[PDB]
Design a protein around this nucleic acid. Structure first.
Ligand SMILES: [Cl-]
Ligand SMILES: [Zn+2]
Ligand SMILES: [Zn+2]
Ligand SMILES: [Zn+2]
Ligand SMILES: [Zn+2]
Ligand SMILES: [Zn+2]
Ligand SMILES: [Zn+2]
Ligand SMILES: [Zn+2]
Ligand SMILES: [Zn+2]
Lengths: 54, 52
DNA sequence: TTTGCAGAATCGATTCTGCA
DNA sequence: AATGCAGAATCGATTCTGCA
């Protein structure tokens, strides 16, 4: 589907909905290799690398 | 009135003392429903409103 | 159509400031 | 002058979206 069962928002793709759901479930598949930080989306990890590891 | 962490200046020593918590991580405002803690009163007030 | 990059927009959470 | 409440202003870690 494309509707979030938590917050009711409607998305352009099933693909992004599934990413979106991570924000409610707490799943965070992108692990920082340098510390124990994890992120739901790729952009958050990239930002984390640029600012805490430099 | 000068902070030694970020070099910023503040209007009073009273607020400078509060400001330092942003760096030192001292969080005297404590939620009585969960383990949340805050440096400034407004943060605790916001926390209580939407969460509890 | 489904996946993905990349970075701007968003808005929760916090800091700063007007006034007492 | 020093303390303090309360809300305006700001920030930034994440979500969202133009584009491919
Ligand atoms: Cl304390
Ligand atoms: Zn949702
Ligand atoms: Zn969208
Ligand atoms: Zn890290
Ligand atoms: Zn480090
Ligand atoms: Zn400082
Ligand atoms: Zn709480
Ligand atoms: Zn929360
Ligand atoms: Zn910003």
């Amino acid at each position: 589907s494309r509707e979030c069962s938590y917050c009711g928002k409607f998305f352009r793709s099933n693909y992004y909905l599934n990413i979106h759901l991570r924000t409610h479930t707490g799943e965070k598949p992108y692990k920082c290799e340098f510390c124990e930080y994890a992120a739901a989306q790729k952009t958050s990890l990239r930002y984390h690398l640029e600012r805490h590891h430099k």
